[PDB]
Design a binder for this molecule. Sequence first.
Ligand SMILES: O=C(CO)N1CCc2[nH]c3c(Cl)c(Cl)cc(-c4cn[nH]c4)c3c2C1
Ligand SMILES: [Zn+2]
Length: 331
Amino acid sequence: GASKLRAVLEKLKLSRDDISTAAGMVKGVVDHLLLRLKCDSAFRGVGLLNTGSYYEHVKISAPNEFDVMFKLEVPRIQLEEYSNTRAYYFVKFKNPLSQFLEGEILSASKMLSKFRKIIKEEGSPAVTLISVDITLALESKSSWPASTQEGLRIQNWLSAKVRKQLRLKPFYLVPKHAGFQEETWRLSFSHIEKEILNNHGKSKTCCENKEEKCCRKDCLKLMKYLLEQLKERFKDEEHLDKFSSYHVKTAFFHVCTQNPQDSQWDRKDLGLCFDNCVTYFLQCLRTEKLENYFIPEFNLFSSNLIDKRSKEFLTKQIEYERNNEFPVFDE
Ligand SMILES: O=C(CO)N1CCc2[nH]c3c(Cl)c(Cl)cc(-c4cn[nH]c4)c3c2C1
Ligand SMILES: [Zn+2]
């Protein structure tokens, strides 16, 4: 009964106990850069983004590297859509950050340079320094941009009441450049993704008692592990470098929308539920369409982002893994 999958989840768990002391190693360094960045005039309002502040690794199989976001409050921000890219925006103001202005557009590269220099004296999203990536993120308490109006389709799964509640929380903007226009900012909903993951069932008591243990989380871990295993095996063939755990997480949220009932995620159906996630992710690869869960018109599997041969290469390897009962999972 899917004994191979649960042995993979067990092996992954046994490599996540030495971090209870290795997270304090990272939590201490963060509070230093957090406390020292407040001495500068620009970053007076920085903070640890996640409410629980638990730093989530992009790689589920690399317990050594972490990823953390620094959030700074700013006066009322106004956005301008860049070249019909539904996620990239220029930032204006409706204050200390004026030193980074390039006319009206708030400069992303100017803020990174000063962000790098302050930490240096202690692709484009984060700077690195066990390993830790640190991404800067502008917090906007305004309503979510128009391109998010038909996203977050959780109404039949987490209820329209919860959706309306999540839309009231702020959204975030990280420096990211798309050509490669060096001055745009990209939308970020990492806080919404974390809240959905830890509050994932249609029942409010999902995974709060043994009678309601679902395998939603375990399926996502298996999807993350499958991709990381394939990316490592074929690291010398360049097609798989584009793919990341965010693509797998995005496709996972779509499968949750497609399967809104908790009964469709029974613990006993781990093999069937994981197979549902592999099939849907394969469909996204073949059709070259994996839309952002919050921005439906931002296709993460578009040609401009990931080449087509890479997608059919990953399709080839995933289908090979599925047909052979996943040899990357054994031993
Ligand atoms: O490592 C990388 C790639 O550099 N990623 C992991 C972290 C992350 N977070 C993202 C958010 Cl929040 C949004 Cl909106 C979009 C994308 C995105 C993914 N592919 N193209 C855009 C991402 C990514 C991607
Ligand atoms: Zn659950």
